[PDB]
Design a protein around this ligand. Structure first.
Ligand SMILES: Nc1ncnc2c1ncn2[C@@H]1O[C@H](COP(=O)(O)OP(=O)(O)O)[C@@H](O)[C@H]1O
Ligand SMILES: Nc1ncnc2c1ncn2[C@@H]1O[C@H](COP(=O)(O)OP(=O)(O)O)[C@@H](O)[C@H]1O
Ligand SMILES: *Cc1cc(-c2ccc3c(c2)OCCN3C)cc(OC)c1O
Ligand SMILES: [Mg+2]
Ligand SMILES: [Mg+2]
Lengths: 385, 384
């Protein structure tokens, strides 16, 4: 029993799912492609054709879903969007929805990026949640991407946003409300379903209080330490403490294994031929013993320790020495004995995961102390301005 | 066993059809649309990006297909276009083809409007033919539409396809397309035949100037007009061929309502004009033949029974047959029910009532009333 008003056509029996306050979404058509069509009560939700036009007239960013065309029926409003396979909540809640085929952290880099694109054109999303981060259907080689949908519309005194993800200062807007929401979603994904506030019913309450958890992050894992450090600044109750949408992208939390290793070698070079009295070297072993674990020669594999002893030249209490030794072994890698090669290798992946596995706080620390040289030529890929 | 060449993609098993010079067409993908992919050997066919980009840069005509995007393989070229349900070939020939919601004359009209659009952008097709006029798939409310494709491509290894090639290109401008068009016109209308007219001898006889048009009776109106236009379209002198938009203004396309309206406007215009007048004189030039000696004797008994009371009606004079037309149509409401039922309902059955009996009436009037071409009333009827 089809309908037209098109432009967009559809059938009312192909219901994708109900939205907020009347708004419902069915599966319709357009050119001759399958499309998701969303009917909204003009009395409830206010489209901003202005923003969306700034989006169209601007260059396509592949992580912000596209609005095909808009139609204003006499009593309604109708919108057409890319029939995505699922929202983030599907991806997160049934691991086997068949990603297959799409990494969590890259999903987060995409989401955060599309968001950076939105914040670029001075448009704020104001309702970021897993239900508004949709995953497309398999591409040409069967890859899947992440796009932010349902951005640009709002409510007209029927508080913007959705209970559970509403930045706290918006209860009592700029980009920070979107950053906060995003932080909650990073935690939603990484932790495979939990929320930092954390159960549905007391969620918005605890947000307004300041109650977090992040109990998923052990403090003995490199990965978890970095994730925690980022999310904390993301969901900071003082909205000024919240990272810029792009600042988030630049953070360690995303870095390739190659990137991390490179960072260790680059630090090891830049702090070389630099005296101990200097600011950098002084600051770098400020935490000293703690990150190195007293003697770092003592925490590693036997072959490595054996080889190292023959040079030392190597402290064991100095982070700087662990970095110099890392850089060194990476440099002379091919001409190293087979024993060590097997204990360390491959490269960069297993080589850098070797040292961060055994010094969870190494990267975190080095990166913190090396903040001094943020403006330098080499360190631009690592830090923000 | 999928292929790639991003962003297009297709399973090679899902073939749609083979083409000229090794060119092949498959069913594949683009965004997430099903889409037809046409791979060409870049050594045989040259794509004209400039033209197509000009098509994109202009407003979309609904009977002109859309080239989505092009990509070059290292050894090939790929081109993606709207998947269509058939070619005009099928439309015409497969007995149980649902040409649903689409009369033939409106198909040729859509086609010729698309051509007007393309000529308007100074882009010439060069290979118009049944395989290059495609049928869409049922839209929102089911309606089927036709569009032209494979334009903007050419051949490098003579343009055109054997059987639809203008003669003088052998011995290019828009005239070639008008000609080939004329051919497909007859083809569609004749329900399968060709003006020239058998596959092997087609091109040959076109060179020779041999036509056919045998499906065109001289006692049925439709045939007479279709003929009237096709003949001009498939002339051997490319200077005779009417412009793509000119072909549109032609009678062949008019709804019966328009036809009847033309007879009325003509009847009105001619009234109060001297019978020696060059226009009246011209209108009656063909005379006798078209009114069938005494047009009063060539109409239903009730109508002549009712016409006998007035005349005033010469009976050998198109001016009077046309005036009776206008006058009965006007005073229709008051006319006896007998006459009402031999005639009605207006416009369709009524204008049919006259064109049926006087097949040439319309053709003839149209030709003779070309003298008032420029007048403001007669712009909907004629080409300025
Ligand atoms: N662009 C889309 N493509 C496919 N499904 C969609 C799309 N947008 C929304 N949906 C589906 O419709 C449901 C309701 O969406 P919406 O009405 O915007 O409320 P929500 O805030 O939950 O997204 C969602 O669960 C989602 O599955
Ligand atoms: N858009 C399309 N959709 C479906 N089939 C098509 C399409 N375009 C072309 N074809 C099929 O491919 C065949 C060959 O097309 P092509 O290689 O362009 O040569 P030609 O057009 O001269 O026949 C046609 O006869 C037609 O059946
Ligand atoms: C671990 C390590 C190894 C070397 C090193 C120096 C010189 C040579 C070498 C390895 O192998 C091939 C050729 N060659 C003479 C040097 C180091 O200190 C800079 C360290 O730490
Ligand atoms: Mg939504
Ligand atoms: Mg074709």
């Amino acid at each position: 029993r089809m309908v037209i008003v098109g432009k967009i056509s559809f059938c009312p029996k192909d219901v994708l799912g109900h939205g907020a306050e009347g708004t419902i979404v069915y599966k319709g058509m357009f050119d001759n492609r399958d499309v998701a069509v969303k009917r909204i009560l003009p009395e409830c939700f206010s489209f901003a054709d202005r923003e969306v036009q700034l989006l169209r007239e601007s260059d396509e960013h592949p992580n912000v879903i596209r609005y095909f065309c808009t139609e204003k029926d006499r009593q309604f409003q109708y919108i057409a969007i890319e029939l995505c396979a699922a929202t983030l909540q599907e991806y997160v809640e049934q691991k086997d929805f068949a990603h297959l085929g799409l990494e969590p952290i890259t999903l987060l880099h995409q989401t955060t990026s599309g968001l950076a694109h939105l914040h670029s054109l001075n448009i704020v999303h104001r309702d970021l949640k897993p239900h508004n981060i949709l995953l497309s259907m398999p591409n040409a080689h069967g890859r899947i991407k992440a796009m932010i949908s349902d951005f640009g519309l709002c409510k007209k005194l029927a508080v913007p946003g959705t209970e559970g993800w509403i930045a706290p200062e918006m209860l009592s807007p700029t980009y920070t409300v979107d950053i906060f929401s995003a932080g909650c979603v990073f935690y939603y994904v990484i932790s495979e379903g939990y929320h930092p506030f954390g159960k549905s019913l007391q969620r918005q309450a605890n947000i307004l209080l300041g109650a977090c958890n992040l109990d998923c992050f052990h403090s003995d894992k490199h990965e978890d330490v970095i994730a925690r450090e980022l999310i904390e600044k993301m969901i900071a109750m003082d909205p000024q403490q919240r990272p810029s949408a792009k600042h988030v992208l630049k953070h360690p939390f995303f870095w390739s294994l190659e990137k991390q290793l490179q960072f260790f070698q680059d630090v090891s070079d830049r702090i070389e031929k630099e005296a101990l009295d200097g600011p950098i070297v002084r600051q770098l072993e400020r935490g000293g013993r703690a990150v190195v674990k007293m003697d770092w020669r003592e925490n590693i594999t036997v072959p490595l320790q054996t080889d190292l002893r023959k040079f030392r030249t190597y402290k064991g209490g100095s982070v700087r020495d662990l970095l110099r030794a890392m850089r060194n072994k990476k440099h002379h890698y091919r001409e190293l004995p087979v024993e060590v090669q097997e204990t360390l290798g491959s490269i960069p992946d297993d080589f850098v995961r070797y040292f961060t596995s055994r010094f969870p706080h190494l990267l975190s620390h080095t990166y913190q102390a090396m903040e001094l040289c943020r403006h330098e030529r080499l360190f631009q890929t690592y830090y923000w301005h």
